Design a protein around this nucleic acid. Structure first.
Ligand SMILES: [Zn+2]
Ligand SMILES: [Zn+2]
Ligand SMILES: [Zn+2]
Lengths: 417, 426, 512
RNA sequence: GUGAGUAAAUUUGG
RNA sequence: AAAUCUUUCUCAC
């Protein structure tokens, strides 16, 4: 069955009728004339004689059952067929010469081929370029990772507090106190109040990035699951304080202040300012009615909020724990400290990975996996795989990268491979 | 008048385009899955409806119970072959008022590859996620079990479980002249391929269905099909040797040139026909039995046959027999393929390359090494390091494939193409 | 935590990065890198290998797979209203339909035959010419792809004209065929694990393994290299037209058209780019920018480097390395004896996306893990129980369920914490069948699909077609109406309403 | 550019 | 105001 004969077949079946009304010849290429549920065995089917008819050119056999009647279209204008009636029908129907278009090959050369080749010749071509010189050396040592971490620390430094990371621990306030503090902080920030919800209004932007510094690690993250669940809930429940068993947050839509006619409800692209509470003792302290708490904010877009809120802290922790070596105690700045370090800080690191929507820790992990499997690497280039600071921007991703590098260094220190 | 708008300027369009234009548009909701499920309590209402209406109507599936002992092994690609509806079945279902699209969707045979590192004694296939525990696809008659086993435990005096003649439950399909004779014991039928159909008097015959599946042809009814000679009775009453080999993916075992034995109950192979330890035994079994179409080859079959022919031009008789067996293994039955490596034209291009590799069912074989006598006579050793590696066993006297530590040379060795892994004369 | 894993670990447990950034910056960076490479200062985009041994496919009939030309994925449609070129993002189906409408043609095969048959570039093929087709096919639109683990900066992808896609389909199909015919070990259609296993077998005879990656793969494959390969395999005028459009490609960024004469834009010609290397030597098991070659001595390593350079396969010095105890390709790592490297490997976590769909996805992931040697079965059982507990914490509120029957999951109000082994071996209440990886779709999936669907003027339906009718046949409005009427009449003669839904699994279950 | 209002994400997750 | 060309709702002339 070839579509090249389709039209030809249509000419063969030309208002031919049998049984006083019923169409005689049914074309296999016609979707209406086809008989449903009947496999095709020729170009067309004759119902009067119950026979399959196939059209062929001279010396060009077609793969049809031998029982199918072949109408040979001779090179000279002439039609031969074993059945006389079909031969006569071919003679009368094919009065106008119906030349079957030949088969086009993939290597067909069009008439415009030379012109297009000349056009390509006239267009620019690349230059050869230099052949790189590759030196294969041992993978980076602990000193290189320490140097990378030290360079990051020198470049960016540290914040005084953990900011939103501190929200992974309890703020030491009851639900009513937490709600009061969040609402009064929103009021003190001059957030607009409308329809029982808080909105943050903005007019102009400096069009420059926010300050970037490394976050010191809190002691632990007991509320990681609660915090992630609250962030997940805040995706659509924004403007009002959301409560969990042990903590609460406030997601405030960030919308432009056009003037009298300004946006009043969030849309798909509206960003959120997530406000959380932690224990006081930093510059973000807020006091109201004797209740004190550090209020820390985080600016997210809808995709970031969804990605953060969809993560499973407990399952990831267990899966990592399945085949984990002993985790050493570490200090506030991710340094090995047996005397006063805390192992629970590792959980905090995991929480940070959940908060980091850029997941630069994944890139660090892939490069470290290559490092551990490698016998030789390119000189001065493999080391230039942990320098991912230029790929990210923000306090959270920068801290995540720094603590991923710290984890690599700690692994190279306490469990050499 | 949507036709004149969607396809303005054209009166006719293909069914593909029309169907693609009638696909219901789906919008990517920005909300999370949780919020979408909460919206209007849609998931709550769906759960209520399911528990009240749909759940009682769900048929109860049988519980998997058959297990075999397994051991950890190399990572392998387990192939699960789920067959599609036959053309006759699909036609009947469509004529009965079933959805045409759904019937069309199930018309294609499907093969799925899944990585597993677990092997049983009989190279059984395992259910999804239960390879470690040993749950097998196969379900436990003694003759039915012995037919599918390479080495039957108890011979029964018939071809199914050892050398012997044909039993009532066994049928065979053979090729004589330009006809396919199918003999079951009660009925005898003859089939021929016209263009793309297998025309036979009784296409519904089970042996006819098996033959159509093997040849990859659409069954068809043709009362005007007859053959001159028919030794099927003598073949039925004669005894043939039973080669030790698992059933081919089609569920049959070869017994003569272009002849296959089928068991009525054993539908499809439930165990890996081709494996690292059995590849060359399978190749030797079908040395001169013609094309089998039992092993899939990565890439082009024509290129694989060219490489096999090139390796065939130089080699000892044993290597030639092995190469012919491989060619028969990879060549489909009844198609225009010159699998015989004695009349196939030698391709000068194939000799240009230094190494001749063929990938049969995920097994990469260097035919040059086969010619030199590696997979059967002597193993190949490559030194990886001069330092001992932790967790690696010492080198055995006749090592199989794998990484070992040799204290004689105090080095880490990687053994490949080991006769202890491919020949395994035991 | 990934740093302290005893075995290999890619750190895939968390989801991939997300970004709402516009794609202008990434596309601009890619175009700048391509322009830099064109100057021949950083990498090599001049192919000097010998492809004269590739078989010529020029005599093969010109066949086009219509299905690949229609889809809901995005594409760029170009319009010339008042001398200005306007590029719009539409669906591939709509773009192809518009192309076929402008050039009156029943099917894409007819269109390509007409294009190849005209005697002049200015000859009309309807409301257009080959010259206009080539002019419009060089315009691309930019977009962003995210959720790729290990890529904090989301990558830039490009939507092409329907004509460009039409020619690309043919050239790529024939390149894949030539790869299957010429490649030492065919891998274009294999998965990551199959490629890794084949590579482990292949590199078993050499001491050292080069786990290599290519950098700037898309920006280094020049139109000249593509034309070289296509001429070697005999694509005739189709290859010339495609190379011409590639060389003159322009990308619409924001509101400005930027010329990118250097390299290609994305992995459009993956098979052709792979053939650019495979056609010069048989020493590499590779597809696209990933190869697993092996060597025995430093001279062989230098030879490998020269072969890579000559084929515009610039080695990535950042990520490529040499190993002796393992081999990694397509992120799959194996020992030299074929075993899967111990550790979590590429195991990925399951995010919360529904009470039951989450459990089903976790079951599928754990089944994959236990089928390999990633973890023992008891670990999978414990992890499944933990996941059930987490789902109970998350989804056990009135907004998701109001039931209390015991057989339900604890996350839907029940008291049943199913065992992984019991679930896998169909040893559970039927309500749990949907949770089986091979079971039916869960309630969550159906609800989400219904929500997605439920959101002008519809063409008359062409469903419930005879399964034997080829989809390449032509139908008009009258034919569609007649087919629908005939099928409805046949159904009525059976005393049937709209056709009964057919489920292959249910039908097979009833078969015995 | 002017004016006007406030279908969509809050209903409903501890 | 912040992870800073993103936080850009609708209708009418
Ligand atoms: Zn603070
Ligand atoms: Zn028996
Ligand atoms: Zn006979």
């Amino acid at each position: 069955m070839d579509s090249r004969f389709a039209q030809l077949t249509g000419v063969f079946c030309d208002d031919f009728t049998y049984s006083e009304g019923s169409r005689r010849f049914l074309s296999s290429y016609s979707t209406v004339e086809r008989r449903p549920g009947v496999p095709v065995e020729g170009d067309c089917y004759d119902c009067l004689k119950n026979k399959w008819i196939a059209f062929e050119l001279e010396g060009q056999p077609r793969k049809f059952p031998k029982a199918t009647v072949r109408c040979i279209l001779n090179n000279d204008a002439t039609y031969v067929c074993s059945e006389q009636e079909y031969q006569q029908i071919c003679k009368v129907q094919f009065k106008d010469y119906l030349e079957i278009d030949g088969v086009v090959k993939v290597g067909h050369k069009a008439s415009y081929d030379a012109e297009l080749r000349e056009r390509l010749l006239e267009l620019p071509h690349p230059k050869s370029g230099p052949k790189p010189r590759i030196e294969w050396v041992a993978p980076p040592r602990l000193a290189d990772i320490s140097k990378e971490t030290a360079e990051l620390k020198r470049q960016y430094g540290f914040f005084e507090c953990s900011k939103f990371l501190a929200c992974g621990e309890e703020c030491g306030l009851d639900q009513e106190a937490r709600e009061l503090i969040l609402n009064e902080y929103a009021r003190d920030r001059e957030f607009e109040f409308r329809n029982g919800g808080w909105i943050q209004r903005y007019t102009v932007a400096s069009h420059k990035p926010a300050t970037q510094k490394i976050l010191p690690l809190p002691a632990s993250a007991p509320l990681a699951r609660e915090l992630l669940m609250l962030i997940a809930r805040s995706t659509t429940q924004a403007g009002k304080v959301l409560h969990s068993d042990n903590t609460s947050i406030l997601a405030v839509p960030v919308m432009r202040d056009s003037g009298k006619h300004s946006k009043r409800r969030p849309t798909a692209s509206t960003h959120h300012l997530v406000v959380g509470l932690s224990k006081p003792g930093c510059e973000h302290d807020f006091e109201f009615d004797g209740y004190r708490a550090a209020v820390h904010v985080m600016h997210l877009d809808p995709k970031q909020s969804a990605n953060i809120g969809e993560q499973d802290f407990v399952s990831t922790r267990e899966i990592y724990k399945l085949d984990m070596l002993e985790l050493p105690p570490i200090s506030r700045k991710g340094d090995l400290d047996r005397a006063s370090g805390l192992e629970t800080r590792w959980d905090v690191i995991l929480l940070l990975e959940c908060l980091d929507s850029t997941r630069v820790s994944q890139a660090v992990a892939q490069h470290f996996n290559r490092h551990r499997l490698a016998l030789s690497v390119c000189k001065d280039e493999f080391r230039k795989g942990y320098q991912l600071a230029s790929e990210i921007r923000g306090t959270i991703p920068l801290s995540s990268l720094y603590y991923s590098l710290c984890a690599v260094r700690l692994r190279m220190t306490v469990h050499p491979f | 008048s949507q036709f004149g708008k969607s396809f303005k300027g054209r009166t006719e369009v293909t069914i593909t385009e029309y169907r693609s234009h009638t696909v219901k548009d789906v919008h990517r909701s920005l909300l999370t899955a949780d919020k979408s499920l909460r919206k209007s309590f849609c998931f709550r209402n769906a759960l209520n409806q399911f528990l009240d209406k749909d759940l009682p109507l769900l048929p109860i599936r049988p519980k998997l119970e058959s297990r075999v002992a397994v051991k950890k092994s190399k990572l392998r690609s387990q192939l699960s072959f789920r067959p599609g509806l036959t053309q006759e079945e699909a036609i009947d279902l469509y004529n009965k008022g079933y959805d045409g699209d759904s019937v069309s969707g199930a018309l294609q045979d499907r093969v799925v590859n899944e990585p597993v590192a677990y092997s049983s004694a009989d190279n059984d296939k395992f259910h999804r996620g239960l390879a470690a525990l040993g749950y097998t696809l196969a379900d436990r008659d003694t003759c039915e079990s012995g037919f599918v086993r390479a080495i039957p435990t108890t011979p029964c005096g018939f071809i199914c479980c050892g050398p012997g003649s044909f039993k009532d439950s066994l049928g065979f399909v053979i090729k004589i002249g330009e006809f396919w004779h199918m003999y079951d014991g009660f009925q005898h039928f003859v089939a021929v391929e016209d263009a793309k159909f297998l025309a036979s008097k009784s296409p519904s015959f089970w042996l006819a269905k098996r033959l159509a599946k093997r040849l990859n042809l659409v069954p068809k009814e043709d009362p005007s099909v007859a053959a001159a000679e028919c030794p099927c009775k003598k073949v039925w009453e004669a005894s043939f040797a039973r080669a030790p080999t698992a059933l081919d993916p089609f569920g049959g075992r070869a017994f003569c040139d272009q002849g296959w034995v089928y068991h009525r109950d054993v539908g499809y192979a439930t165990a890996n026909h081709i494996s690292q330890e059995t590849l060359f035994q399978q190749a030797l079994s079908v040395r001169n039995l013609g094309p089998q179409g039992s092993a899939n080859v990565s890439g082009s079959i024509h290129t694989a046959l060219d490489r096999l022919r090139a390796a065939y031009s130089r080699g000892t008789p044993a290597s030639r027999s092995i190469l012919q067996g491989l060619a028969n293994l990879i060549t489909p039955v009844g198609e225009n393929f010159e699998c015989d490596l004695d009349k196939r034209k030698l391709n000068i291009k194939a000799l240009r390359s230094p190494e001749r590799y063929i990938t049969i069912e995920g097994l990469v074989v260097n035919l040059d090494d086969v010619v030199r006598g590696f997979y059967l006579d002597k193993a190949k050793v490559t030194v990886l390091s001069r330092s001992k590696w932790m967790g690696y066993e010492d080198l055995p006297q006749k090592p199989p494939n794998g990484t070992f530590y040799c204290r004689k040379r105090k080095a880490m060795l990687l053994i490949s193409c080991s006769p202890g892994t491919y020949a395994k004369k035991r | 935590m990934w740093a302290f894993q005893e075995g290999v670990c890619k750190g895939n447990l968390l989801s991939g990065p997300t970004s709402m950034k516009a794609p202008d910056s990434a596309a601009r960076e890619s175009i700048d890198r391509a322009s830099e490479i064109m100057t021949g200062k950083s990498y090599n985009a001049v192919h000097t290998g010998d492809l004269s041994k590739l078989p010529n496919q020029g005599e093969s009939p010109l066949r086009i797979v219509d299905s690949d030309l229609y889809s809901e994925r995005s594409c760029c449609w170009v319009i010339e209203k008042e001398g200005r070129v306007v590029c719009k993002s539409t669906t591939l189906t709509r773009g192809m339909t518009s192309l076929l409408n402008t050039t009156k043609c029943s099917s894409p095969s007819e269109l390509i035959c007409k294009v190849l048959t005209v005697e002049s570039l200015s000859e009309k093929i309807g409301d257009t010419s080959v010259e206009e087709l080539l002019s419009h096919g060089r315009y691309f639109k930019c977009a962003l792809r995210d959720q790729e683990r290990g890529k904090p900066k989301s990558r830039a992808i490009f939507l092409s004209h329907p004509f460009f896609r039409l020619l690309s389909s043919v050239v790529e199909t024939h390149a894949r065929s030539v790869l299957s015919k010429v490649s030492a070990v065919y891998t274009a259609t294999a998965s990551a694990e199959q490629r890794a296993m084949m590579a482990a077998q292949v590199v078993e005879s050499r001491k050292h393994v080069l786990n290599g990656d290519c950098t700037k793969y898309n920006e280094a494959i020049d139109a000249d290299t593509l034309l070289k390969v296509w001429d070697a395999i005999g694509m005739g005028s189709i290859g010339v037209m495609l190379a011409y459009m590639v060389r003159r490609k322009c990308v619409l960024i924001k509101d400005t058209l930027v010329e990118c004469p250097g390299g290609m834009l994305m992995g459009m010609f993956n098979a052709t780019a792979t053939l650019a290397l495979q056609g010069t030597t048989d020493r590499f098991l590779s597809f696209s920018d990933d190869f697993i070659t092996s060597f025995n001595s430093p001279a062989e390593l230098r030879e490998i480097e020269d072969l890579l350079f000559a084929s515009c396969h610039n080695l990535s010095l950042k990520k490529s390395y040499i190993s002796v105890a393992s081999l990694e390709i397509n992120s799959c790592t194996l020992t030299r004896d074929g075993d899967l490297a111990t550790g979590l490997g590429c195991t990925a976590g399951v995010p919360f996306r529904g009470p039951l769909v989450t459990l089903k996805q976790t079951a599928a992931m754990l089944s994959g893990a236990v089928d390999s040697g990633v973890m023992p079965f008891h670990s999978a059982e414990r992890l499944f129980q933990i996941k059930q507990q987490e789902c109970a914490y998350r989804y056990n509120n009135p907004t998701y369920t109001t039931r209390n029957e015991d057989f339900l999951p604890t996350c839907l109000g029940g008291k049943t914490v199913i065992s992984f082994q019991s679930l896998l071996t169909w040893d559970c209440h039927p309500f749990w069948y949907q949770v089986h990886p091979d079971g039916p779709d869960t309630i969550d999936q159906k609800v989400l699909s219904v929500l997605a669907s439920k959101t002008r003027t519809r063409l008359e339906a062409l469903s419930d077609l005879d399964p034997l009718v080829p989809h390449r046949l032509l139908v008009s409005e009258s034919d569609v109406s007649k087919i629908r009427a005939a099928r409805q009449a046949h159904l009525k003669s059976l005393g049937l309403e709209q056709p009964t839904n057919f489920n292959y699994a249910i039908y097979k279950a009833v078969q015995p």
